[PDB]
């Protein structure tokens with residue numbers, strides 16, 4: 001693989017969004033991964049509707065503003081035959097009735113791939129596929145108040161993840177490697193809404209434990 005990758009530089013990544021006070025991190029992670037794959041497929045970067053996922057993917061197992069899984073989101077898109085644009089189905093940060101309109105569908109998927117649970121496998125996927133949906137342990141104030149540099153938390157769990165985000169690349173700055181991770185907490189958090197998570201340090205915060213992407 002390349003020594004560094006940043007898919008933002010290749011046009012795969014929309015600006016940082018803000019989930020607000022709704023537990024919809026999973027939906028932002030999923031739209032991020034699908035935005036990347038649709039861009040690879042068509043050459044068009046189109047912002048996708050998290051609200052559509054929040055409101056409509058209950059049958060697949062998601063729980064709206066109370067949490068959910070990226071893979072369940074990808075399954076919804078496949079079952080549903082589409083996903084609306086952000087513009088057509090704007091984000092409200094509350095769970096509402098499903099208002100999917102196929103007229104404004106701009107994305108689809110044909111399934112998803114779960115990446116082997118190792119950082120070497122994750123790097124290979126990031127290098128070859130595009131942005132990757134990932135689960136992390138974000139349940140430390142050190143993450144809440146993260147500002148800059150490589151994030152390293154001695155107490156982080158590699159097995160108990162509670163937050164879905166998007167790996168958009170990787171690189172290096174003694175222990176100087178990182179994953180470039182797009183969050184969904186607005187631009188004023190971290191480095192323009194991004195965090196450099198410690199890479200190749202024993203699967204820190206479980207970043208390789210539940211990584212996936214949609215096929216398109």
Ligand SMILES: *C(=N)C1(NC(=O)[C@@H]2C[C@@H](S(=O)(=O)c3ccccc3Cl)CN2C(=O)C2(c3ccc(C(F)(F)F)cc3)CC2)CC1
Pocket residue numbers: 019022023024025026061062063065066067068069070071072134135136161162163164165210
């Ligand atoms: C996001 N704002 C917030 N977090 C979640 O919804 C996270 C997202 C995933 S994950 O990325 O943490 C994860 C964890 C383990 C295996 C795979 C993945 Cl993708 C799940 N999750 C959770 O907090 C979680 C959970 C919650 C709901 C469900 C559901 F039943 F399907 F709805 C499954 C799992 C405890 C793990 C804070 C809400």
